[PDB]
Each structure stands twice: as structure tokens, then as C-alpha cells.
């Protein structure tokens, strides 16, 4: 099984502003929607109600602490232990954010698909430094710039660096 991080921050690493995305990228979203197709979404309560609906063809899965919690068309998991025995037999998941939900699944991310935002806005919540020296390029592609989608922005892909033994 391996463990993807998804996410979209700008070059100060905010991934939101008010439980909300800084920016309007459809395109971006449309590549998300691409890339995570037939795998599960893992997101953390306040990332799901700032997405404000299941997202279609895909594994909702929802990481709270509250066992009350529940909410029609989505999976409910109180703990990363839970996630994992969910999606025992996934090829991949999608850890989609909450800056909380990237912490959690940090010792066993695999893979970093992180599109990267040429610009600063306002936010409050940021996707976590990690050191990238662990980590090498396996794509890069400019996203689409136009009338819908204003920014500059890149789609990067990364791999665990092999060590070399001495
Ligand atoms: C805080 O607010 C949000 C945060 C995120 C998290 C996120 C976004 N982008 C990247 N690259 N990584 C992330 N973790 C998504 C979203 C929304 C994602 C969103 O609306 N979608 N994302 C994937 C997806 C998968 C299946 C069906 C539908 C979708 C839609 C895309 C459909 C479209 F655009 F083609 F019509 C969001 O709400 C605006
Ligand atoms: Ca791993
Ligand atoms: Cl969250």
C-alpha cells in the first residue's frame, strides 16, 4: 500500500485561509480528480466540511477523534491504525490535508504529489516542512495558466531517495 500526500500550497506553504482554498484553480482540481481516480480520499473533519460534499468515484474516508461522527456517502476512521485496516487491501491512498492529517501519516508517506502555487496569499493552516533531501523528482508539468485558472502553478511528483551504501 502506498501512502501518497495530495496538496496544493503556495510558496509559503499555505494550503488554506478560514478552512477554505486561498485560490479558485479548476484546472488544479481537475488534475486531483484525475490523479486520485479509483483511490481512496483521507481527510481530516474540518478539510471535509471546507470541501462541503463527497467527492464522486472516489473512497471518502474521514479521520476524527469523534466517534459520533457521521456523515452519509463517507467512511469514518478515528485513527490512523483504522485507516490502514480500511484500506487493507488499496493499492494507494490520498491523505488530501488537514495539516493535522499530514502529520499523522507522516512516518509512512511513500509518495508526494504536491502542486506548488507561484504566489503568496493570505492563509492560516500550512502544509508541514519535510526535509527533501529524503525525497527526488520523478515529474514536474506547468499547470494551466488562463481566464479560469490566474495563477502560476507547477504539478511535482516525489519519490523516496534510494541511499547509496558506503
Ligand atoms: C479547502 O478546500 C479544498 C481543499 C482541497 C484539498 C486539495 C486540493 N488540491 C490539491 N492538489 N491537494 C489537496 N489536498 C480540495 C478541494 C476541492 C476539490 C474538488 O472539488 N475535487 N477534487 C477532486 C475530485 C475527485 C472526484 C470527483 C470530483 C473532484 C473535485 C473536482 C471536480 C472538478 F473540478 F473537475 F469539477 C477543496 O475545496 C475547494
Ligand atoms: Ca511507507
Ligand atoms: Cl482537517
Excluded at 510558496?11 to 486531483?32: A, C, F, H, M, T
Excluded at 493499492?91 to 499530514?102: D, L, T
Excluded at 525525497?135 to 481566464?147: A, R
Aim: net charge negative; proline share 5%.
Amino acid at each position: 500500500m502506498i501512502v501518497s500526500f495530495m496538496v496544493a500550497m503556495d510558496e509559503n506553504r499555505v494550503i488554506g485561509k478560514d478552512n477554505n482554498l486561498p485560490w479558485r484553480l479548476p484546472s488544479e482540481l481537475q488534475y486531483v480528480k484525475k490523479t486520485t481516480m479509483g483511490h481512496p480520499l483521507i481527510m481530516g473533519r474540518k478539510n471535509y466540511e471546507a470541501i462541503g460534499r463527497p467527492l464522486p468515484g472516489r473512497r471518502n474516508i474521514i479521520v476524527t477523534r469523534n466517534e459520533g461522527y457521521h456523515v452519509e456517502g463517507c467512511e469514518v476512521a478515528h485513527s490512523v491504525e483504522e485507516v490502514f485496516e480500511l484500506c487493507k487491501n488499496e493499492e494507494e491512498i490520498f491523505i488530501f490535508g488537514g495539516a493535522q492529517i499530514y502529520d499523522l501519516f507522516l512516518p509512512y508517506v511513500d509518495k508526494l504529489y504536491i502542486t506548488k502555487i507561484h504566489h503568496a496569499f493570505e492563509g492560516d493552516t500550512f502544509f508541514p516542512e519535510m526535509d527533501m533531501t529524503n525525497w527526488k523528482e520523478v515529474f514536474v508539468e506547468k499547470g494551466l495558466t488562463d481566464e479560469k485558472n490566474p495563477y502560476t502553478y507547477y504539478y511535482h511528483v516525489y519519490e523516496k531517495q534510494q541511499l547509496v551504501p558506503r
